[PDB]
Every structure is written in C-alpha cells, then in structure tokens.
Design a protein around this ligand. Structure first.
Ligand SMILES: NCCC[C@H](N)C(=O)O
Ligand SMILES: NCCC[C@H](N)C(=O)O
Ligand SMILES: [Mn+2]
Ligand SMILES: [Mn+2]
Ligand SMILES: [Mn+2]
Ligand SMILES: [Mn+2]
Lengths: 294, 293
C-alpha cells in the first residue's frame, strides 16, 4: 500500500551481456514516468545511482566477459543495498542486465542476520544458472543465480556474504534452459513453473506455490526479468524468447507478489530501450504499477 | 559537472493554487519525463526526492485558495528545514511562485535565528503584491511581500521571522504593479530589470549579487522561468516580452551555481499544459547550467 520511503537504486549495467543500451533502462523508465509511479506509493524516494563503468566491452571468445565490471558493480550494489534495505519499506533495483541479480541477492543477504532465511522468486525466460565453463555465451548475466548458490568463479561467488541454496529459489516463466542449467534444476530439485506450466495451471496457483513455499522464510526477494514476459509485449530486451508469460498474467503476478508481507525488495531487469523503447517501456511500467497496486 | 555533491534533495511541489491556470502543478512530473533525474545523476549519486502533498480541492476575492497555499507552504517550509544542508544542494521544482514563501521560510527555519539569508529573485514580476493591492487575487503575486511581513496573517506567520527588503536582489523584473513599485522605491530594493540587464551585461549582475551578499550566511535563488524571454519559455502562465535571453539565463545560472553561499534553488512556473517540449528542454538547460553541465 503506502510506505514511508522507497529506495530506488538505478543500476546502469550492460557488462553482463554484449548489447549496448540496457544500461540506459533506468534513464528511460524515468522518461516514461517511473518517478511519478513511485510518487503514488511514498512521499519519499531515496534514489541511489550505482556507478556506471566506462571501459570498452571485450567482445571476443571468453568464458566470462567483463568480469571486472560485473564484479565492481555487484560489490557497490550489495553494499548500497545492505545499508538501505528495510523490512518496513520497499527497495526497487532497476537494471541493467541480470548480472546485477547477484549483487541484489548479495545485498539482501548482507542486510539480514546470517540465520535469516531469504527466499528468491526469479521471474525470467532463463534460469541464469550457467557457469563460465558451461556457458554458451560467456555473458555473466546468465550466471548470477549460479554465483549466488556458490557455483561459479571465486571473484563472483565471494560477493555473497554466504550462499543461498537451490531450495531458496522459485523460478517463474523459465523456458530457455541450457544443459548445465537443466542439470541443476533436476539435481537440486529447484521449484519452478515454466511458461508452459504457468499456462496450464494458471498464475493463481503459482502464487499459492510461492506463498506456501516461503511461509517459514524471513524475507522474499523478487528478481523480475522483463523477458520472462512474452515478446508480443516486451521487445526492448536483448534475449527475447517466445511462448512466454502473457502481460495479463505478468500483471496478476506482480499484483499478488506486491501483496506479500515478506516482499521488501524487487529487481526490474533487462530493459534495453535502444532495442525497443515505447511499447516495452510502457508495459514494464504497467508491471511496476501492478506491483504497487495502482 | 562541474560541481559534485554527496546528495541532492529534490522537493517536488505540485502547486497550482497560487494562480488560476491548470497544469503548473504537473511541472515536476513533466521535467521528470524530459530527463530531470538524469541531470541530477551527473551531480550526485544520491537523490532524496520529497513530494509535497498536492491539494485536491476545487479552484475557487483578494487572496484565492488561501487554505491550499497555506497548507503547502507549511509542509514545504518544514520539509526544507529538515533537509536543507550547507554542504549539499536542495532543489524545489514548482508549481507556481506562491511556493517561494514556503521555500524562503524553510531556509530561514533551517538556519539559526541570527542568520543572514539573501534572496536572488529571478522573475518578470516582483511578487510583492498584497491582497489589498493585487489586481488578480492570485497568491503567487504575493509570496515575497509575505516574506517581508506584508500580507495576511496566515501567510506571513509561516515565516519563523521575516526577511527584509534589503535581503532581496531582483533580476529581470519588468511587469511591476503600482504597489510593487512603491515597495521597490520606498524600501530601496536592489534590482536589475530585464532592460538594465541588457544595458549593463549579466556579468555585472553577478558582481552586484556577490558584493551584496558578502556579509550574508546563505543565498537562496528563486528562479521563475518567465523571467526568461517568451521566445524560449512559452510554457508559463504569465509570459512577458523583453525578458532575459536564454544565453544570459544560462550564464546567470552558471555563475549563480559557483556561489559558495548558494545551497537552495526554486525552479517555478513551468506549465507544460501550456507548452511542453520547447519550454521543458530550455528549463533543463538552465538547471544544467546551474550545476555546470
Ligand atoms: N540471461 C540470458 C541467458 C542466456 C544463456 N543461457 C547464456 O548464458 O548466455
Ligand atoms: N506571478 C505573476 C504576478 C502577476 C500580477 N503581478 C498579480 O499579482 O496578479
Ligand atoms: Mn535473467
Ligand atoms: Mn531472461
Ligand atoms: Mn514569480
Ligand atoms: Mn513571474
């Protein structure tokens, strides 16, 4: 409903993938009235901008591309979130590519006591459980949730104060799954509704599954990749994938996520307005509004 | 930049009730669409935005919508008193110029009572009318009169203590009512009209500001966009010709921004429902110049 404040962290990060422009997602959501949405929810908005790295993209064969830039940003992001996270208020991270999700889950973990049970809802076309060794792309944005559970290189996994586990993850709308990511989902029994599962069961039952799963957890964190949503509605994204979640289901999802007492932090990620601006931009904002119940 | 700060306090003030025309309450919202936040992002990594509550009563004598201008200026004063900071920058975005009472009130309330607060008031209008001598009854023509203690009790009492006429530097004034002219001659209020600015050059306005506030603790800048010529600024309720050129307004903001005493700025009277893109962009160029971009 209403909050004393909303912490808004702009995270201009493109270095988790190859395509330019996703660093300008915060800027472009601001042009389309993001601040005015937050103005319906809190009279106070503490915006933090995470420093944009300005080194050239390395674009050749590499198993983890621009590690320095993804490291530096996730460290700064974790630290900012640790200071600003608040179970009485809402923190919203706007990306930036999904390599920030390491930084964001790291931050939430760092804010809590070590005995705190942190749940993660990961709404996405991709599980992002690749490692540098099994990654087809070397794009670190495919690796973050692997890094959070301790699978990955030392410089990323060490950003976690301690690791979360596979049993703390609820995947929603996953479809594009690599071989190494499929291994983790079957081997670790990671709860998930694929896009196809969502269609069959109905997004109502995804919510009951989220609510029943995190009953004994302290906090929930939502990492919302816009490309979990069908490309009919979301074009401004670097890796679109068909048969996604409908916009209708994404708004119902955000509506019911927003009503969870445990939910105090949200990432909105992978908006590249240089790919597509107005249609995508507006639909992202409808999802964000639904989260706040506007 | 230009200048870096630890933070910038951004107070959105959606106030239309100081005048008649709808849409000036949406100035903050519309500056945000045109990239205001991204401008502040060049200056501080932190932005604490505060939204002053928009009154939602119908628009209604000698002082129009007193309740709404009172309630907003009280909330604005109080917010500023908590957030004002001589090491950082506070920027108020209006809203009509009836908020300038609230903003000067806030700066005064933030300082110790013995503090000398200077005011640079860049505007086509002196805004020194009282309810009795006002042609319009629009409270946005009255705030600076209220600040010096001329006006009704419910507005003048918002000041912890009053500023005086000798604390005001007017820049670009041209449209002057009879009662406002009385105050300028009678109280010897320092001023450069738009015509004076042209003749002397905006460099000498700055030297006059710098030499005048040498003994003061802080300066506050209240910047009405209609002080700027209507060639460049159309989205404003009361435009007035022969104003300050955009070139001079950017040089003005550049040199204002470099004043050690300047820690607070109002940007006021943007009505994007009158005109949006041209005006909106030029307002932002002025704001960027203030930060030295
Ligand atoms: N978030 C996109 C992931 C795409 C692919 N699994 C990769 O690792 O490149
Ligand atoms: N801010 C515009 C002022 C207009 C006129 N002096 C009045 O008091 O109505
Ligand atoms: Mn992702
Ligand atoms: Mn994805
Ligand atoms: Mn004015
Ligand atoms: Mn004016």
């Amino acid at each position: 409903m209403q909050f004393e404040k909303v912490t808004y962290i702009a995270v201009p990060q493109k270095y988790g993938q190859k395509k330019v422009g996703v660093e300008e997602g915060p800027k472009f959501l601001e042009k389309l009235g993001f601040m005015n949405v937050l103005e319906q929810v809190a009279k106070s908005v503490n915006k933090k901008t995470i420093t944009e790295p300005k080194t050239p993209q390395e674009l050749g064969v590499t198993n983890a591309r621009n590690l320095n830039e993804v490291e530096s940003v996730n460290i700064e992001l974790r630290d900012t979130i640790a200071k600003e996270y608040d179970v009485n208020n809402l923190l919203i991270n706007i990306g930036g590519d999904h390599s920030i999700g390491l930084g964001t889950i790291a931050g939430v973990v760092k804010a809590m006591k070590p005995n705190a049970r942190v749940g993660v809802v990961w709404f996405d076309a991709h599980p992002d459980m690749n490692t540098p060794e099994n990654s087809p792309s070397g794009n670190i944005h495919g690796m973050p949730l692997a890094c959070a559970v301790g699978l990955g290189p030392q410089r990323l996994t060490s950003i976690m104060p301690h690791y979360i586990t596979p049993k703390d993850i609820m995947y929603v709308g996953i479809r594009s799954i690599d071989v190494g990511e499929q291994f983790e989902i079957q081997d670790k029994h990671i709860d998930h509704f694929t896009a196809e599962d969502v269609k069959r069961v109905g997004m109502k039952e995804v919510i009951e599954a989220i609510n029943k799963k995190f009953v004994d957890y302290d906090v929930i964190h939502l990492s919302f990749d816009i490309d979990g949503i069908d490309p009919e509605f979301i074009l401004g994204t670097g890796t679109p994938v068909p048969k996604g979640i409908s916009l209708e289901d994404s708004l119902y999802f955000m509506s019911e996520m927003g009503k969870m007492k445990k939910l105090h932090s949200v990432d909105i990620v992978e908006y590249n307005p240089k790919i597509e601006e107005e249609i995508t931009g507006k639909n992202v904002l409808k999802c964000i509004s639904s989260l706040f119940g506007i």
